[PDB]
Write a protein that binds this ligand. Structure first.
Ligand SMILES: Nc1ncnc2c1ncn2[C@@H]1O[C@H](COP(=O)(O)OP(=O)(O)O)[C@@H](O)[C@H]1O
Ligand SMILES: [Mg+2]
Ligand SMILES: [Zn+2]
Lengths: 198, 49
């Protein structure tokens, strides 16, 4: 089940949600939260509709009339004529799947290196080697917020995270960084959060 | 439709063939009056329900 992206909502509307169907190789190619890009064909699917208003019956074209005691009236006649309601839903049949915004042009560092192209890999390498990368990342990630350099640095470290670990007895050592911002109103806290999300 | 010549060597008595029948249900006693019988040598299969 997918729903329309926020970039396409009309005014005052609720996003339209439709079910798309993946077949064969693509069966598990979409995961929750992903901004996928389904390519395929729209289709209709017969529906067992609960509409109490009759509509669009389909029946035989052979003119047959029940004899006395077996008249084509009621459920008997409906069944004999083969009357069925033509109620449909719109469903999407996706042959291929792919993210809307590709990140690159199990998981491991070598896997990421291979997945990313030569230009992207060289850019990553050169920025990794670049000096003052800490300040560069902070500034490039928060180009509108002034001050709060400590908050910027903390959020960057949170984004990079730690190294989760598990002890011999089983107890786990959390490696994720938790950050909280407390302060006076209009101090850019929501701005930091929205930067992080976007 | 055929027109043929012959000689009648027998003639059965004149009996009563129903052209309409009224069938009544045993349980509710409701009727299905005026069921059009076919003409000639032919029978009728009563409704089962
Ligand atoms: N230190 C700051 N530097 C740049 N802009 C700021 C700063 N503090 C507040 N603002 C501006 O004030 C606006 C409202 O801030 P807001 O996100 O509501 O903070 P809070 O949620 O903590 O009240 C923001 O859109 C932001 O541009
Ligand atoms: Mg706020
Ligand atoms: Zn009866």
């Amino acid at each position: 089940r997918i729903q329309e992206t926020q970039a396409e909502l009309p005014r005052g509307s609720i996003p339209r949600s439709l079910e798309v169907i993946l077949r064969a190789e693509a069966v598990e190619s979409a995961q929750a939260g992903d901004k996928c890009d389904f390519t395929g064909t729209l289709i209709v699917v017969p529906d067992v509709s609960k509409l109490s208003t009759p509509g669009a019956r389909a029946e035989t074209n052979s003119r047959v009339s029940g004899v006395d005691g077996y008249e084509t009236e009621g459920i008997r006649g409906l069944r004999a004529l083969g009357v069925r309601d033509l109620s449909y839903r719109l469903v999407f049949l996706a042959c291929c799947v792919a993210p809307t915004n590709p990140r690159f042009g199990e998981q491991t560092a070598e896997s990421i290196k291979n997945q990313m192209t030569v230009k992207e890999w060289e850019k990553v390498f050169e920025m990794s080697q670049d000096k003052n990368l800490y300040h560069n990342l902070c500034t490039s990630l928060f180009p509108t917020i002034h001050g709060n350099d400590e908050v910027k640095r903390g959020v960057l470290l949170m984004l990079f995270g730690g190294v989760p670990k598990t002890t011999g007895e089983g107890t786990s050592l959390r490696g994720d960084i938790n950050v909280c911002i407390v302060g006076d109103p209009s101090t850019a806290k929501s701005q930091f959060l929205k930067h992080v999300e976007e | 439709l055929v027109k043929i010549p012959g000689i009648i060597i027998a003639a059965s008595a004149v009996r009563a063939k129903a052209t309409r029948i009224s069938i009544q249900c045993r349980s509710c006693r409701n009727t299905l009056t005026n069921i059009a019988m076919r003409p000639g040598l032919e029978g009728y299969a009563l409704p089962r329900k």
